[PDB]
């Protein structure tokens, strides 16, 4: 079984978005009004699932082929790749990375999305993979379109892909959203702007990566992820 | 001071989180292996329990698009990190609220006692992370059991909650669902009876 | 018939791209090596077709509906609108504006395009309209995807839409390409860079126009066009 | 000095120009009304002529993806700007080279004489703008007629070409195609026999 | 035998010198006038020779002893050392590095060099070695002197040493010239200036490296070489 | 966008390239092991062939100081990267033009067929890199064989050359030289008959 | 992106709004023509109705200085923009709360049905803008009618309110006042029963 042998750098909750960010309207009723209660890390917080023996399908990381109903999906073919490291710069190998997104037109394959842009019969919108032994992951997909939503009267999400990353413990687990270099919708979005620090926003912007592209085939974007720094215990209980 | 690389900042899981993390709920086909809400095969040791709950916003209305992740010790008080659908028990699982009724369920066993970092026993608990539309960074909580009053009273984690009344928000209620032992654990994100959320 | 009653400001051929721009490889063999021969403007150069009585179909300016084969095209719904003026700032009313583009995936509906990204059965890629009496035009379409092409070994066009504008004479007629705000492919493209002056490149970049968008429906981009300034003749033949 | 708004800069029409401007050639359906290569209904006055040509690059190879726009006076030396498919004659038209043979064609009448701005007659001519992949800004030229030698000799536009040998590059050759009067006008963009291109 | 399991980042041919750089007069007649034809990488381009089992003489890397005719060569004794890496920063081990140069007076040991400065009887001017397991190479030599040449009427090469580097494939192979920190000839040289970007020129300038010198014996210069980035293939043929 | 470390920029190999890379030719003593123009020992399997050629500049004059590196498959269409002077065959070699007649020679076997990355067979070819004074970055080309005309017509690399006429510049001409099979491959850097050069 | 001229920013109407907009209420003489709370003369077609209401703050106390503007369709569901005190009916009016009891009143007809931009019928409604000291930008709401329950259940505007409970805040209660049909519409700016406010 798992052991308590490490500690995780405390989160900066002014770097992360705060709970209450009223321009993102749904956060008003869904943010606690009491302060979070700080507790010391124990084996409960410092361990978590390892997914080495989860059985992945052949196309689980390839959205151009994992919803195949007779053709290729329509849209901009891209590889999304990067590295998962901790705050000390250590790679995070064999970690679960999951991603989901709308299609090229900003339509999600979810019963609750009624946006008038059509579904793509050959696009599902979900992928998963493990980072390799050096902490790298990669997916192939189509670039998602912006999605309008009922926040303000003319609010549109920038093109974005959701990411969930397990990391080595439940204390490191994170869901975030990737945005794309240059998207003029990024400065305007109340969800992006739930993050107060402009330098933190920049950390969510994937960069065009011509070096990783397949010529005559697909472009590529690079999105690196940093999880809480992990260190050994020292001088505890003495 | 020493400044490390900043952590990637959190964002909401959004209303369509189930596309990626709860494929059935999205209305979509599942893959061969999914991480879901059954932590115990029937033959796993320990007391088999049904867990269930609803999640309420600050206006007392159901949060119908919640996504929950849970992490718990097996009946022997050991965390099992080697996730495998062949295992009799996994310490990790996922669940989500129905869009209609707003209820999530988990199938598990009651966790055994585990010690904190100072060697003090914690009361049996399940660690819970809650994600949804409108939640910018996930909320951490713990589910404890109302039939562990003696242990709960002595838990060094519960005892860090300054107001005793707030401790009650983390105690799940034992009941029976179809002749089988169950606990209800509702979460109130905001307002009267607001659930304690942790930072660590 | 038409009359010679106006003169057009001479083109700045260092503002326009030069003929020979060797990084755009096809320009090497298709650029003259002799200097252009300057001639004075006459009725031949200073008149041109007016298309007021060209009969346009109902959907000729609407690419979401003008290639309808049972559904909507997949991709980012956008309005593209702007004003056509001359260099003096005068609007250019009732002028022909034609546009064409690839689909959301960078695939053109042309027999010669064999790029592996699929065609969209409900997308054709051509539109036309006349500017209104104040010089405004508008189209509805999907945002085109980048298109790889056999120039250098890893060359990709930014998302672009071709435009042709008649204006009041054959001397004003222009074909150009519209690019989209923030596209990180723009600085890298040898066709964009056939234009030497960075300020001229900026003139081809359409800006996100939230003010003209339809909420819950389509975004909008604004692309204004400036044609050669037109003035009356003065002091000629005396 | 006085600086006006800069003109929008030109870009190549690209290899798929026919999608937008020559729908048949792209392999695509046409719309009800198209601007194309027939400037004259059969009953229009003047001498009915077939025009045709090929376009060569600097290595002497065919430019198979050329797009051409033409502007010419009617037989009476008048420019007709009111474009209408009901007209017996339009002064404007479009054509393109076949991808296979590389030949464009126009169906028109021989234009009448028009005076320059100083009142001097120009020889009969058709104004041509040439667009293609690899051409960053369109090339302007004129097609004159080899059976107008006397007028050509006196044309104040031809006479602005400094070298007489270059004048010959703008003179189309009279022939017959199926018993009907035709002129061939080839364009050489670059090199030996390079066609004169104009700026105005 | 060799396999096709890697791809090499496409060259930036505006960072490299162009073929036609007329101030370097011989380039006028020895530059193509047609554009290069881009072709996709295959095993023909992504493989190349490995010289691990080429047999080196004891003094192959040591130009102070490899043309010994009774004494040491005259001139500034120096070590030239550095690392060969690729664009991702990865060391390039066991790669062949060859170098050649004029003597202390700018005279080459070649039948065709008739510059009036004398040959040195104990200097040949050629070295070779393999990089070590960590990508490092090392030569010992004499600092070459400037060499006049029949380009312009008073042109003089800065002090320079030629380098040839094989790397992992024929796609990475490179010949270049090393120049020396602070040499005032460098900005005036039409061969240096065949490279249009000043930052690129700076990448050829070896830096005085006192840390690597042998006191009372020889100075040292450091010259690191960057070859094209190598990556694994991904998502090809699917 | 992502910017990696920039590659070290190329410079010309210069007129005295031979002293570093073609020691015999410089007029100088050779080392015990040199990389030179004999890719195949008499015992290597495959058809033993002589290759020879001259290099011309844009004025039609011999480039008497060229240096060439070659890379080819063995007779089985396999590339042999383990370079060793003890090998019956090496896939790599070097040659240079004589200052007197300006001819280079190579002693090799005809390469077997290799597929491109898409699995389509390439006609037999030798990869060539050409260096010299006046060449700021080496020119890449390929030598194909005129006795492989049917394979050459289907080569997906030759077919990337848009104009069929230019493909001819890459086809070496078979001849007999002292009773052995030979091919001449002349390279024209610039002008009429300019050899195709590749970027990859 | 495209940035237009910025709109002039709002400021509170202040506690003395009445001197500019509700002259009677300020304690002041009125002009010959005032825009006030009688939208319908006795002769206007439609069901004549009295509307009345009070406004509460977040502490449950009356807002005794509120100023309200209203906009509604006539009995045919047509908006009448040509404001004239000679009209039997005007679509626009103003009212204010008494400083003493804090009640506003309006004299009008029940509006007819109007469709949204998509052609779907809206339940009968009055559009309201609320101004006062402490309100930095006016609050928009709508008054619907409790005797239109079946129409209200299908209103595509009421249906944009995610929680059914909040829709109830917009439904005025029918009563009789001195033998005439009346509806009470109370507004709670903040807290329990907070009235829905719109942005458009
Ligand atoms: Cl579908
Ligand atoms: Cl189709
Ligand atoms: Fe989303
Ligand atoms: Fe294009
Ligand atoms: Fe030199
Ligand atoms: Fe005031």
XYZ file of N, CA and C in Angstrom, chain C residues 110-217:
324
model
N -11.781 22.356 -54.175
C -11.200 22.528 -55.499
C -10.536 21.198 -55.821
N -10.706 20.740 -57.061
C -10.212 19.424 -57.447
C -8.707 19.277 -57.196
N -7.957 20.386 -57.297
C -6.488 20.369 -57.106
C -6.007 20.327 -55.656
N -6.899 20.560 -54.687
C -6.487 20.452 -53.270
C -6.620 19.017 -52.757
N -5.490 18.392 -52.454
C -5.483 17.012 -51.977
C -5.055 16.909 -50.515
N -5.083 18.030 -49.794
C -4.792 18.003 -48.355
C -5.713 16.985 -47.685
N -5.147 16.227 -46.760
C -5.824 15.084 -46.169
C -6.975 15.415 -45.215
N -7.100 16.683 -44.792
C -8.261 17.078 -43.992
C -9.536 17.045 -44.839
N -10.655 16.547 -44.260
C -11.823 16.281 -45.091
C -12.563 17.524 -45.550
N -13.258 17.400 -46.679
C -14.272 18.355 -47.048
C -15.445 18.281 -46.079
N -16.191 19.381 -46.031
C -17.408 19.481 -45.251
C -18.566 19.488 -46.270
N -19.469 18.490 -46.181
C -20.518 18.355 -47.192
C -21.452 19.550 -47.291
N -21.497 20.385 -46.248
C -22.354 21.565 -46.237
C -21.560 22.874 -46.331
N -20.328 22.788 -46.813
C -19.540 23.988 -46.994
C -18.940 24.089 -48.386
N -19.223 25.208 -49.058
C -18.724 25.465 -50.415
C -17.517 26.390 -50.414
N -17.605 27.537 -49.763
C -16.424 28.379 -49.625
C -16.399 29.616 -50.492
N -17.506 29.961 -51.146
C -17.533 31.199 -51.932
C -18.687 32.097 -51.558
N -18.423 33.402 -51.516
C -19.481 34.364 -51.350
C -19.296 35.583 -52.228
N -20.379 36.328 -52.422
C -20.302 37.635 -53.100
C -21.400 38.546 -52.609
N -21.188 39.856 -52.743
C -22.199 40.848 -52.398
C -21.794 42.186 -53.008
N -22.670 43.183 -52.942
C -22.289 44.551 -53.251
C -22.222 45.329 -51.948
N -21.299 46.277 -51.851
C -21.354 47.232 -50.740
C -22.681 48.016 -50.803
N -23.182 48.426 -49.645
C -24.413 49.205 -49.632
C -24.100 50.662 -49.985
N -25.093 51.532 -49.873
C -24.930 52.899 -50.321
C -23.963 53.717 -49.461
N -23.568 53.180 -48.294
C -22.605 53.827 -47.396
C -21.247 53.117 -47.419
N -21.128 52.105 -48.285
C -19.854 51.402 -48.525
C -19.629 50.152 -47.696
N -20.638 49.754 -46.907
C -20.529 48.556 -46.059
C -20.880 47.254 -46.776
N -20.160 46.194 -46.426
C -20.494 44.859 -46.884
C -20.609 43.942 -45.678
N -21.217 42.783 -45.895
C -21.133 41.708 -44.909
C -21.409 40.311 -45.434
N -20.675 39.370 -44.864
C -20.782 37.967 -45.190
C -20.989 37.193 -43.898
N -21.570 36.003 -44.003
C -21.568 35.084 -42.860
C -20.882 33.829 -43.330
N -20.008 33.256 -42.488
C -19.225 32.112 -42.904
C -18.715 31.328 -41.698
N -17.847 30.356 -41.944
C -17.127 29.725 -40.852
C -15.655 30.162 -40.944
N -14.997 30.284 -39.794
C -13.566 30.629 -39.800
C -12.754 29.492 -40.472
N -11.975 29.819 -41.534
C -11.168 28.804 -42.211
C -9.996 28.343 -41.345
N -9.606 27.075 -41.488
C -8.442 26.568 -40.781
C -7.165 26.867 -41.549
N -6.007 26.798 -40.868
C -4.743 26.960 -41.594
C -4.547 25.856 -42.628
N -3.770 26.158 -43.663
C -3.597 25.253 -44.800
C -2.080 24.999 -45.039
N -1.618 23.728 -44.942
C -0.196 23.523 -45.239
C -0.009 23.504 -46.763
N 1.176 23.879 -47.215
C 1.405 23.990 -48.644
C 2.899 23.722 -48.901
N 3.183 23.293 -50.123
C 4.520 22.856 -50.475
C 5.434 24.009 -50.884
N 5.759 24.847 -49.921
C 6.737 25.898 -50.126
C 8.044 25.429 -49.445
N 8.319 25.903 -48.236
C 9.350 25.287 -47.404
C 8.821 23.941 -46.904
N 9.639 23.156 -46.188
C 9.212 21.814 -45.758
C 8.150 21.788 -44.631
N 7.933 22.897 -43.939
C 6.870 22.926 -42.886
C 6.138 24.259 -42.848
N 5.570 24.622 -43.995
C 4.935 25.946 -44.186
C 3.426 25.791 -44.106
N 2.795 26.684 -43.334
C 1.361 26.652 -43.113
C 0.810 28.077 -43.300
N -0.201 28.233 -44.141
C -0.859 29.540 -44.226
C -1.595 29.788 -42.911
N -1.601 31.047 -42.427
C -2.564 31.384 -41.352
C -3.973 31.210 -41.888
N -4.979 31.157 -41.009
C -6.364 31.174 -41.444
C -6.538 32.412 -42.318
N -7.111 32.271 -43.514
C -7.257 33.452 -44.377
C -8.467 33.341 -45.275
N -8.990 34.483 -45.721
C -10.111 34.477 -46.669
C -9.639 35.393 -47.799
N -9.760 34.926 -49.027
C -9.415 35.770 -50.189
C -10.526 36.775 -50.436
N -10.149 37.991 -50.835
C -11.097 39.034 -51.175
C -10.775 39.607 -52.557
N -11.799 39.805 -53.393
C -11.620 40.596 -54.609
C -12.605 41.747 -54.582
N -12.132 42.943 -54.907
C -12.951 44.146 -54.865
C -12.790 44.883 -56.166
N -13.912 45.201 -56.822
C -13.884 45.892 -58.137
C -13.518 47.342 -57.991
N -14.237 48.039 -57.111
C -14.136 49.496 -57.034
C -14.587 50.151 -58.352
N -14.443 51.486 -58.459
C -14.983 52.283 -59.570
C -14.258 52.123 -60.917
N -13.073 51.515 -60.934
C -12.350 51.349 -62.222
C -11.427 50.145 -62.204
N -10.943 49.732 -63.379
C -9.966 48.643 -63.432
C -8.657 49.029 -62.748
N -8.427 50.333 -62.617
C -7.265 50.838 -61.916
C -7.388 50.597 -60.380
N -8.610 50.467 -59.872
C -8.813 50.248 -58.412
C -8.951 48.790 -58.006
N -9.217 47.918 -58.975
C -9.502 46.529 -58.711
C -8.339 45.859 -57.972
N -8.670 45.023 -56.983
C -7.647 44.471 -56.069
C -8.063 43.072 -55.655
N -7.107 42.157 -55.555
C -7.320 40.919 -54.815
C -6.355 40.963 -53.636
N -6.841 40.564 -52.466
C -5.988 40.515 -51.278
C -6.421 39.328 -50.386
N -5.783 39.177 -49.223
C -6.174 38.125 -48.291
C -6.364 38.747 -46.920
N -7.437 38.326 -46.236
C -7.767 38.758 -44.890
C -7.152 37.729 -43.940
N -6.536 38.197 -42.850
C -6.029 37.301 -41.818
C -6.754 37.654 -40.510
N -6.586 36.831 -39.476
C -7.369 37.024 -38.226
C -6.518 37.426 -37.035
N -7.003 38.423 -36.300
C -6.339 38.969 -35.145
C -5.688 37.873 -34.266
N -4.412 38.059 -33.950
C -3.709 37.167 -33.017
C -3.147 35.868 -33.560
N -3.489 35.516 -34.807
C -3.004 34.260 -35.366
C -1.469 34.189 -35.332
N -0.935 33.234 -34.543
C 0.512 33.201 -34.442
C 1.218 32.735 -35.749
N 0.466 32.254 -36.740
C 1.056 31.867 -38.030
C 1.375 33.053 -38.925
N 0.767 34.191 -38.644
C 0.909 35.382 -39.517
C 2.384 35.855 -39.705
N 3.153 36.025 -38.603
C 4.557 36.478 -38.773
C 5.446 35.489 -39.513
N 5.007 34.230 -39.612
C 5.817 33.138 -40.151
C 5.571 32.875 -41.640
N 4.530 33.481 -42.212
C 4.100 33.105 -43.554
C 4.839 33.871 -44.633
N 5.477 33.157 -45.574
C 6.191 33.826 -46.685
C 5.286 34.573 -47.675
N 4.011 34.215 -47.761
C 3.057 35.020 -48.555
C 2.715 36.350 -47.836
N 2.354 36.288 -46.543
C 2.180 37.524 -45.770
C 3.446 38.377 -45.937
N 4.610 37.759 -45.732
C 5.867 38.502 -45.753
C 6.366 38.925 -47.148
N 5.592 38.639 -48.195
C 5.845 39.243 -49.517
C 5.660 40.763 -49.421
N 4.904 41.179 -48.398
C 4.726 42.586 -48.036
C 5.878 42.956 -47.103
N 6.748 43.875 -47.547
C 7.972 44.211 -46.783
C 7.724 45.065 -45.546
N 6.746 45.963 -45.639
C 6.462 46.916 -44.582
C 5.518 46.328 -43.521
N 6.010 46.141 -42.285
C 5.111 45.549 -41.258
C 3.776 46.279 -41.036
N 3.758 47.600 -41.243
C 2.528 48.367 -41.104
C 1.515 48.007 -42.191
N 1.990 47.681 -43.393
C 1.080 47.194 -44.431
C 0.481 45.839 -44.092
N 1.275 44.948 -43.519
C 0.750 43.651 -43.091
C -0.421 43.851 -42.130
N -0.277 44.797 -41.198
C -1.318 45.036 -40.188
C -2.625 45.430 -40.830
N -2.539 46.024 -42.018
C -3.752 46.432 -42.696
C -4.640 45.245 -43.192
N -4.072 44.039 -43.210
C -4.745 42.845 -43.701
C -5.268 42.020 -42.534
N -5.131 42.548 -41.318
C -5.544 41.718 -40.183
C -6.922 42.200 -39.680
N -7.918 41.349 -39.839
C -9.279 41.618 -39.372
C -9.316 41.543 -37.846
N -10.108 42.421 -37.222
C -10.150 42.498 -35.763
C -11.431 41.876 -35.256
N -11.316 41.139 -34.160
C -12.513 40.631 -33.478
C -13.443 41.803 -33.177
N -14.739 41.637 -33.487
C -15.702 42.726 -33.412
C -16.920 42.252 -32.584
N -16.779 42.289 -31.257
C -17.822 41.725 -30.362
C -19.119 42.505 -30.530
N -18.985 43.789 -30.885
C -20.125 44.692 -31.069
C -21.097 44.255 -32.184
N -20.574 43.525 -33.164
C -21.340 43.086 -34.330
C -21.742 41.614 -34.230
N -21.435 40.977 -33.101
C -21.719 39.551 -32.980
C -23.211 39.317 -32.707
N -23.711 38.122 -33.033
C -25.031 37.660 -32.543
C -24.836 36.766 -31.299
N -25.249 37.224 -30.105
C -25.063 36.388 -28.901
C -25.688 35.015 -29.092
N -25.046 33.972 -28.539
C -25.523 32.596 -28.583
C -25.620 32.079 -30.034
N -24.855 32.666 -30.958
C -25.081 32.393 -32.370
C -23.751 32.458 -33.125
